[PDB]
Amino acid sequence: SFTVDSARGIFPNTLTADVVPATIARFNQLNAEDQLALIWFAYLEMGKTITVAALGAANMQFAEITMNQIRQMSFQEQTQVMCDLANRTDTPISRAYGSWTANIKLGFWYQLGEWMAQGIVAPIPSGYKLSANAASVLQAIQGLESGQQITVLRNCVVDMGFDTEPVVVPRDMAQRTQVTIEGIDNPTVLNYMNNMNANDFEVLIELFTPDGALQPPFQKPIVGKDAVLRFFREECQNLKLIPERGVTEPADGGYTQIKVTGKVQTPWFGAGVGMNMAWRFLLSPENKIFFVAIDLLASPKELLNLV
Amino acid sequence: SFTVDSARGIFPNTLTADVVPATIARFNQLNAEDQLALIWFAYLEMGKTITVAALGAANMQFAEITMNQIRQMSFQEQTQVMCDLANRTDTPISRAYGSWTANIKLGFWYQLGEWMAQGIVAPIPSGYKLSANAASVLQAIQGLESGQQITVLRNCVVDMGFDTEPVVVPRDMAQRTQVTIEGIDNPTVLNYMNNMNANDFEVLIELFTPDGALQPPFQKPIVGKDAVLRFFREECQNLKLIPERGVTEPADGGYTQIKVTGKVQTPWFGAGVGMNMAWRFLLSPENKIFFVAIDLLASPKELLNLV
Ligand SMILES: CC1=C(/C=C/C(C)=C/C=C/C(C)=C/C=C/C=C(C)/C=C/C=C(C)/C=C/C2=C(C)C(=O)CCC2(C)C)C(C)(C)CCC1
Ligand SMILES: CC1=C(/C=C/C(C)=C/C=C/C(C)=C/C=C/C=C(C)/C=C/C=C(C)/C=C/C2=C(C)C(=O)CCC2(C)C)C(C)(C)CCC1
Ligand SMILES: NC(=[NH2+])NCCC[C@H](N)C(=O)O
Ligand SMILES: NC(=[NH2+])NCCC[C@H](N)C(=O)O
């Protein structure tokens, strides 16, 4: 008698990094000039660690034209467009940005940021002073573990713009890895991990029930194979899933609940940031994925919390 | 009675970094596996310093599809394509690469390199041993000043492939800088520098005589406004020219010869690499550029060599 909403609560003693959504909500109270300056300052203290590995799959060409338009504007116009994005204003550029996939939005700011650092576009005021609320939000971010810091920054950037085609390459079979998970050998869980690591989403989606759902960290469940597969193709390429250990528990009505913990790397940072993750699966009696939740964990001890 | 070939020899006591072409020629003797491994090792010791600032103007989309094709190949095929490029073999991919602008060729390898570092494509053997000739070439490169090192690497990469559309954005007028040059106020030289720094090549080209020529470092003169302007648009965007000082000397027949020294930054590295440069101008009696040579200098003392 499970529903997606009932499945959401499996393994309730998993401690997620709710400071991430808390800090994002605080950032969302700031004025646009404070938001831009805060991220610029965080960027100046970790921007060298962002890699180009996600750009190649994103298909940036149309967004890069808009990027180049900003390179042609005056100082006043460049500042206006950047505030329009942060304010989520209804402008043509803000609508275009709001329509892009997360990786395209990130690739846009990544390049604008290097251009600012070089003066190819104008940077942010050299003696700029954050408001009191903004300075406190910056302090909070700087105090977070690396994987929580980059999740704050990512969600702050992806949420900009106005609420209004990737190159997906499955890895050659001979170059694919096989995960090991201490305590877990169920092929549905192992091949969830392996097909994710190989970008083989057409095989991956067949592990799901037709009504199956996937819940990304701090987001609502994505329901149905069509929506889940779209999410895979748009946002989930070139991840490195490094599960470590897991536990299996019977559920009502022949269902099985599985918790796996481990680390995940995003191509935006490669091995420079290891994000502590949990995967919570509810498998049907036919051993298909009815529900999987992916959680960013509050601290590294949560990797060892299988009770 | 000046010709381009006679103009080439002005200011002959300018000491250029001929170790750069010497080292490139040595690299050109190596087998492809040695060439790939040598650059990979140099890359592992300076790849974090390459920035994304040149990608946005390059218009990479077609090349990125070919890049992604390599991401889909097996280990054997990825190694074969990389050797085909280094060997300058006649293959369809090598012909495509050979047709691309320098910045597109560099953006291709830049992304392939990050993908290798992350294992998104297969890297280079972990216990690979350079041949004796290759190990000696690597030592030579590692011993060069930073600006000479990146010129070696650039020309080694750009020369790969088979000898078989950028987004050009002039900077808004209010955001343009004006160079200062100790000892030089001739507007033809100052506005050569300023229009280069503003990517304003349509204004820049009008400073040249119709038969005027530009000689890039270690290359043959590019002759005629059409060819020079094409070179500007394809290869010369987002440079930072920081001239320091110069000297003017009369030439025969009302011509004027001018030597300027200073530093140049490429968007590939921003302020991380300052390249020591000389500009050697031969100006017509009408104060137009008949010939300009751009030289990479052998050492920093050449910045002070105006005799
Ligand atoms: C704005 C701005 C600027 C630029 C800021 C820049 C440049 C920010 C760049 C930030 C970036 C690039 C952050 C990247 C973060 C990426 C993360 C945190 C990825 C996390 C993915 C995870 C954890 C995936 C988990 C999953 C698993 C494991 C599954 O099993 C199922 C699917 C999937 C759920 C998705 C400038 C400076 C100019 C100043 C002005 C304002
Ligand atoms: C291959 C390869 C790999 C990747 C290697 C990579 C990634 C190399 C990247 C190298 C780069 C990116 C080098 C960039 C160098 C750029 C330079 C040196 C720019 C110099 C420009 C100048 C000096 C301009 C001077 C001019 C002036 C001032 C003028 O007034 C007139 C016009 C202009 C003349 C042009 C992998 C690792 C995967 C391993 C396999 C083999
Ligand atoms: N047989 C059972 N129903 N066991 C329940 C396991 C509860 C688990 N230790 C938790 O804290 O969430
Ligand atoms: N009046 C002259 N012609 N002077 C020639 C200057 C030569 C210059 N000092 C050089 O070494 O190249």
Q: Which residues of B3-21 are buried (b: 16+ CB within 10 A; e: fewer)?
A: ebeebbebbeebebbebbb
Closest CA to A78 of A129, A124, A47, A27: A124
CB contact under 8 A, B55 and A56: no
Q: Is the domain of A149 the same as that of A189?
A: no
Strands A222-223 and B208-215: unpaired
Grouping H, G, I as helix, E, B as strand and the rest as coil, residue A273 is coil
- DSSP letters, B140-185, are HHHTS-HHHHHHHHHHHHHT-S--------PPPGGG-----BBTB-
Residue where one domain finishes, among candidates A128, A163, A198: A163
State the Cα angle at B216 between B212 and B220, rounded to 5°: 75
- DSSP letters, B174-233, are GG-----BBTB--HHHHHHHHHHHTT-HHHHHTTEEEEEEEE-TTSPPEESHHHHHHHHH
SS3 content of chain A, % helix, strand, coil (to 5): 50, 15, 35
* Residues in Cβ contact with B230 at an 8 Å cutoff, skipping those fewer than 6 apart: none
Q: Is the domain of A249 the same as that of A196?
A: yes
Q: How far apart are CA A187 and CA A196, in angstroms?
A: 13
CB hemisphere CA count around B15 (13 angstroms):
10
Secondary structure letter of residue A73 according to DSSP: S
Order of strands, edge to edge, in the sheet holding A275-283? A222-223, A208-215, A289-296, A275-283, A256-265, A240-250
How many residues comprise chain A? 307
Say how many C-beta atoms besides its own lie within 10 A of residue B301's C-beta: 10
CA-nearest residue, atom 29 of ligand 1: A294
Q: Is the domain of A145 the same as that of A217?
A: no
Chain B interface, mutation test: which of A71, A75, A233, most B Cβ atoms within 10 Å? A71
Q: Is the domain of A211 the same as that of A150?
A: no
Q: Write out the residue range of the structural domain in which residue B57 sits.
A: 17-163
Q: Which residue of B has its CA nearest to A198?
A: B120
- Kindly list the residues from chain B whose CB atom is less than 8 angstroms away from the CB atom of residue A198: none
B180 phi, psi to nearest 5 deg: -115, 140
Closest CA to A8 of A206, A305, A235, A280: A280
Residue A124 lies in a domain: yes
Strands B289-296 and B208-215: parallel
Dihedral sign computed on CA atoms, order B114, B116, B118, B124: negative
- β-partners of residue B267 are none
Closest CA to A55 of A94, A106, A115: A106
State the Cα angle at B133 between B127 and B135, rounded to 5°: 40
Q: Is the domain of A210 the same as that of A129?
A: no
Say how many C-beta atoms besides its own lie within 10 A of residue A3's C-beta: 11
Give me B216's structure tokens: 């890039």
With contact defined as beta carbons under 8 Å apart, do B243 and B197 qualify?
no
Q: How far is the CA of B21 from the centre of ligand 1 (A)?
A: 42
- β-partners of residue A256 are A250, A283
Closest CA to B118 of A266, A105, A107: A266
Query: Which amino acid is residue B128, in one-letter code?
Result: Y
Q: How far apart are CA A71 and CA B237, in angstroms?
A: 12
Dihedral sign computed on CA atoms, order B43, B48, B50, B52: positive
Q: How far is CA B66 from the centre of its chain?
A: 23
For chain B, how many structural domains are there in total?
A: 2
Strands A208-215 and A222-223: antiparallel
Dihedral sign computed on CA atoms, order B292, B297, B302, B307: negative
Residue entry with tokens 């700029």: A128
Q: Is the domain of B238 the same as that of B295?
A: yes
**C-alpha torsion B224→B228→B230→B233, nearest 10:** -160
Q: Is the domain of A225 the same as that of A184?
A: yes
Give me B285's structure tokens: 């009696």
Q: Is the domain of B87 the same as that of B30?
A: yes
CB contact under 8 A, B71 and A56: yes
Q: Is the domain of B204 the same as that of B260?
A: yes
Q: How far apart are CA B52 and CA B103, in angstroms?
A: 11
Q: Is the domain of A280 the same as that of A228?
A: yes
Q: Is the domain of B58 the same as that of B93?
A: yes
Dihedral sign computed on CA atoms, order A16, A19, A25, A27: negative
Q: Roughly how many angstroms between the first and final C-alpha of chain B, as a whole number?
A: 24
Residue B170 lies in a domain: no
Q: How far apart are CA B47 and CA A201, in angstroms?
A: 31
Residues of A near B (Cβ–Cβ under 8 Å) read 48, 51-53, 55-57, 59-61, 64-65, 67-68, 71-75, 110-111, 114-115, 117-120, 122, 167, 169-172, 174-175, 238, 240, 265, 267, 270-271
Give me B182's structure tokens: 């100790």
B219 phi, psi to nearest 5 deg: -130, 165
Give me B229's structure tokens: 């302007």
Closest CA to A155 of A27, A271, A288, A3: A27
Residue where one domain finishes, among candidates A163, A198, A217: A163
Helix axis angle, B132-142 to B19-27, nearest 10°:
150
Q: How far apart are CA B105 and CA B118, in angstroms?
A: 20
Residue A127 lies in a domain: yes
* Residues in Cβ contact with B24 at an 8 Å cutoff, skipping those fewer than 6 apart: B152, B155, B156, B159
Q: How far apart are CA A238 and CA A171, in angstroms?
A: 10
- Resolution, angstroms, 1 dp: 1.7
Q: How far apart are CA A47 and CA A67, in angstroms?
A: 18
Q: How was this structure determined?
A: X-ray
Helix (H) or strand (E) holding B21: helix B19-27
Residue A8 lies in a domain: no
Residue A213 lies in a domain: yes
Residue B171 lies in a domain: no
Residue B4 lies in a domain: no
With contact defined as beta carbons under 8 Å apart, do B264 and B242 qualify?
yes
Closest CA to B207 of B220, B221, B193: B193
Q: Roughly how many angstroms between the first and final C-alpha of chain A, as a whole number?
A: 24
With contact defined as beta carbons under 8 Å apart, do A102 and A166 qualify?
no
Residue where one domain finishes, among candidates B163, B192, B208: B163
Residue A10 lies in a domain: no
Q: How far apart are CA A196 and CA A194, in angstroms?
A: 5
Q: How far apart are CA B99 and CA B88, in angstroms?
A: 12
Closest CA to A246 of A4, A21, A20, A10: A10
Q: How far apart are CA B48 and CA B60, in angstroms?
A: 21
Q: Is the domain of A97 the same as that of A232?
A: no
Say how many C-beta atoms besides its own lie within 10 A of residue B74's C-beta: 14
Give me B16's structure tokens: 């250029």
